[PDB]
Amino acid sequence: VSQVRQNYHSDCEAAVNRMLNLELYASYTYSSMYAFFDRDDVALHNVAEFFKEHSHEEREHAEKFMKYQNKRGGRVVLQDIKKPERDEWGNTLEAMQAALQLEKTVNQALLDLHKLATDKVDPHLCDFLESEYLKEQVKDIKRIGDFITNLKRLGLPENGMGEYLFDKHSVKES
Amino acid sequence: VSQVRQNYHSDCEAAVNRMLNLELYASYTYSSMYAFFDRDDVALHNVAEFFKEHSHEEREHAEKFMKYQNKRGGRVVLQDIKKPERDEWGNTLEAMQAALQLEKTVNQALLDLHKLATDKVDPHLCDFLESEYLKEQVKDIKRIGDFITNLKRLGLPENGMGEYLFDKHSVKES
Amino acid sequence: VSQVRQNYHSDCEAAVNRMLNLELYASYTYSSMYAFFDRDDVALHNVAEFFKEHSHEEREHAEKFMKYQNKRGGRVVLQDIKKPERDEWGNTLEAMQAALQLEKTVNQALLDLHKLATDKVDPHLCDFLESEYLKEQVKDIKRIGDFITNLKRLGLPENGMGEYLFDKHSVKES
Amino acid sequence: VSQVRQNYHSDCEAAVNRMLNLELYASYTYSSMYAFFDRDDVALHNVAEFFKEHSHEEREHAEKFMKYQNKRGGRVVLQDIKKPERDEWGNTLEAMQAALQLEKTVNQALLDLHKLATDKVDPHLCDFLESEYLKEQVKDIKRIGDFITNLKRLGLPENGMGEYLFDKHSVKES
Ligand SMILES: [Cl-]
Ligand SMILES: [Cl-]
Ligand SMILES: [Cl-]
Ligand SMILES: [Cl-]
Ligand SMILES: [Cl-]
Ligand SMILES: [Cl-]
Ligand SMILES: [Cl-]
Ligand SMILES: [Cl-]
Ligand SMILES: [Cl-]
Ligand SMILES: [Cl-]
Ligand SMILES: [Cl-]
Ligand SMILES: [Cl-]
Ligand SMILES: [Cl-]
Ligand SMILES: [Cl-]
Ligand SMILES: [Cl-]
Ligand SMILES: [Cl-]
Ligand SMILES: [Cl-]
Ligand SMILES: [Cl-]
Ligand SMILES: [Cl-]
Ligand SMILES: [Cl-]
Ligand SMILES: [Cl-]
Ligand SMILES: [Cl-]
Ligand SMILES: [Cl-]
Ligand SMILES: [Cl-]
Ligand SMILES: [Cl-]
Ligand SMILES: [Cl-]
Ligand SMILES: [Cl-]
Ligand SMILES: [Cl-]
Ligand SMILES: [Cl-]
Ligand SMILES: [Cl-]
Ligand SMILES: [Cl-]
Ligand SMILES: [Cl-]
Ligand SMILES: [Cl-]
Ligand SMILES: [Cl-]
Ligand SMILES: [Cl-]
Ligand SMILES: [Cl-]
Ligand SMILES: [Cl-]
Ligand SMILES: [Cl-]
Ligand SMILES: [Cl-]
Ligand SMILES: [Cl-]
Ligand SMILES: [Cl-]
Ligand SMILES: [Cl-]
Ligand SMILES: [Cl-]
Ligand SMILES: [Cl-]
Ligand SMILES: [Mg+2]
Ligand SMILES: [Mg+2]
Ligand SMILES: [Mg+2]
Ligand SMILES: [Mg+2]
Ligand SMILES: [Mg+2]
Ligand SMILES: [Mg+2]
Ligand SMILES: [Mg+2]
Ligand SMILES: [Mg+2]
Ligand SMILES: [Mg+2]
Ligand SMILES: [Mg+2]
Ligand SMILES: [Mg+2]
Ligand SMILES: [Mg+2]
Ligand SMILES: [Mg+2]
Ligand SMILES: [Mg+2]
Ligand SMILES: [Mg+2]
Ligand SMILES: [Mg+2]
Ligand SMILES: [Mg+2]
Ligand SMILES: [Mg+2]
Ligand SMILES: [Mg+2]
Ligand SMILES: [Mg+2]
Ligand SMILES: [Mg+2]
Ligand SMILES: [Mg+2]
Ligand SMILES: [Mg+2]
Ligand SMILES: [Mg+2]
Ligand SMILES: [Mg+2]
Ligand SMILES: [Mg+2]
Ligand SMILES: [Mg+2]
Ligand SMILES: [Mg+2]
Ligand SMILES: [Mg+2]
Ligand SMILES: [Mg+2]
Ligand SMILES: [Mg+2]
């Protein structure tokens, strides 16, 4: 047993390793979306950069879990990072719909980990999730929902001009 | 009778309290519009902020009436602030049409109060309305009319792309 | 169902709308106190400004709830904002006693909402209340209790000189 | 007839000369109050300076009327400036009560001149009174009423300590 370990359940330790993997999985999916929108036959560079940034965010959140694991005296155990579900992402609407879904999947895993931490009476883990993850999750979900509403408004997937305008106005220029 | 009171008719005092209520009512309606355009299924954030600003303006104008009442030695009497007429505002065109109408309602109440002040030979109240309210009222009515003309030009309510472009170009970015 | 909605109970959504109304109610009561202390026959201007500031604070907290509702995919539903319980507030001691009571009422509604969020296993709503509301609530209650103790010490309600001195020394000069 | 004169009734011209005299009369009364509170057996120097400032304000308002008379092509006609009604002013409460009364007298003369200007269809004179005189009049009346309320609260005329504190806290230190 680690000399630092206190009030840290084995189940929580394991679930933290699974969360770490899920963040790396999410980061990798966003990297795929970045590469797709960088294609010469897609060429929506502000959209591409948006997904690149989110890939870097999820990677940082994985790192955060590693650091957390060690602070509590748990042990980081890594698994394969599965490739994304798709090799190509259709268009900005399809990608944002996938992103929404991915953020909700990540959010459900966070909420599940909070339930577990609650069951094991671990308020440090509960606070950590609340402060570092749950708030920013809800904000990302809201942002992407807002985007999907605007892409629909702009006539996606049929309206190319709408897709062009989204890339100029809705995501920051890169 | 207040020690400061001079040339201040009871009828004017009462009409000032009713104006105060109407400004609070207007502020509350604009707050509703703000919340509507902030919805994830509406998501026109520059439009939302425009209405938020106007809500704050009307609230400040209510405060102004309170201060005025006390300066003249009248007594502030508050009533319920009625909820807005609608819970949802359709789209940017419908909301701006409602806003036009609300500003004209407020303007008519100001003009009615000016008539009353004129009938009661109260030049201080007349000047106050002229300087602090009537000018800025006409400017807000003109601005919103200009907006409605542009929203029609942009193909509202059917043309989503037009609605998207209005939010980017016609109202200041937030 | 909103595309962003996740782990957000209908009961919580409704209780958030009721909290929003209660914050607007509180803001309106403080506005009344502001107008009272601005009267020429009361004329305690630093006290008046204290209540004005608290009115603006509660309004900002209402806005916050609106934004929260939308972030979670709930829907803002507004009701009438009831006028304050009194038209006149007696003196600084009576007003601060009313304010104490109002802050405790608001605090109980926050605590009740935290219980509900806890029952519905909503840690995002729990954290939100904890971070944005509960701490600052306890501080406002303490401040007002401190004031009431000093007003009693100063001989309120009989001792006018004490009331004058409170306005100069206990609340910031405006 | 002056080459500049247009739409300027003889009655208005004369009433402007009487207003000029009344402003000089007011200025002189405030000068008396200044000298009273500067006495070694009164010695309330911040109160004294308050009245000195108001004496200078009323003098500037007299000058303003002179300039106005000439701008319209009327002719300045001066009369004796009557000495103040009292040689000694009792205490801060009595003086502020006299000041309230003097400001209301000046305000009634302004309102009477506005009625006359209205009867003679002189909108330039009406605007002049509205912009340069009537607003600031209401503010001075409110300020002095506020003071009288605080002096009563402080136990004037019996409570010397209250009178001392008013001079330190309610009027700006000189
Ligand atoms: Cl180990
Ligand atoms: Cl342990
Ligand atoms: Cl423990
Ligand atoms: Cl342990
Ligand atoms: Cl264990
Ligand atoms: Cl694929
Ligand atoms: Cl997913
Ligand atoms: Cl967070
Ligand atoms: Cl958006
Ligand atoms: Cl289309
Ligand atoms: Cl957008
Ligand atoms: Cl009264
Ligand atoms: Cl009168
Ligand atoms: Cl009159
Ligand atoms: Cl009156
Ligand atoms: Cl009356
Ligand atoms: Cl509706
Ligand atoms: Cl209306
Ligand atoms: Cl104006
Ligand atoms: Cl325009
Ligand atoms: Cl069209
Ligand atoms: Cl425009
Ligand atoms: Cl909905
Ligand atoms: Cl859910
Ligand atoms: Cl859940
Ligand atoms: Cl849900
Ligand atoms: Cl539900
Ligand atoms: Cl009452
Ligand atoms: Cl209460
Ligand atoms: Cl807080
Ligand atoms: Cl204190
Ligand atoms: Cl006492
Ligand atoms: Cl204190
Ligand atoms: Cl001549
Ligand atoms: Cl003429
Ligand atoms: Cl003419
Ligand atoms: Cl003439
Ligand atoms: Cl004539
Ligand atoms: Cl005398
Ligand atoms: Cl007089
Ligand atoms: Cl003025
Ligand atoms: Cl005062
Ligand atoms: Cl006393
Ligand atoms: Cl004072
Ligand atoms: Mg060891
Ligand atoms: Mg284990
Ligand atoms: Mg595989
Ligand atoms: Mg619990
Ligand atoms: Mg907790
Ligand atoms: Mg984020
Ligand atoms: Mg996220
Ligand atoms: Mg996240
Ligand atoms: Mg454009
Ligand atoms: Mg009285
Ligand atoms: Mg009345
Ligand atoms: Mg109703
Ligand atoms: Mg006029
Ligand atoms: Mg305006
Ligand atoms: Mg307006
Ligand atoms: Mg207006
Ligand atoms: Mg939907
Ligand atoms: Mg429901
Ligand atoms: Mg009622
Ligand atoms: Mg926290
Ligand atoms: Mg606070
Ligand atoms: Mg509070
Ligand atoms: Mg609070
Ligand atoms: Mg000539
Ligand atoms: Mg003549
Ligand atoms: Mg004589
Ligand atoms: Mg005018
Ligand atoms: Mg003045
Ligand atoms: Mg004056
Ligand atoms: Mg004056
Ligand atoms: Mg001091």
Curated annotation (Swiss-Prot), chains A, B, C, D:
Stored InterPro entries: Ferritin, Ferritin-like, Ferritin-like_diiron, Ferritin-like_SF, Ferritin_CS, Ferritin_DPS_dom
Annotated positions binding Fe cation 2: 58, 103, 137, 140
One matching Pfam family: Ferritin
Ferritin-like diiron domain segment(s): 6-155
Domain of life: Eukaryota
Residues that hold Fe cation 1 according to the record: 23, 58, 61
Function: Stores iron in a soluble, non-toxic, readily available form. Important for iron homeostasis. Has ferroxidase activity. Iron is taken up in the ferrous form and deposited as ferric hydroxides after oxidation.
Protein name: Ferritin, middle subunit
Organism: Aquarana catesbeiana
Upper lineage: Eukaryota, Metazoa, Chordata, Craniata, Vertebrata
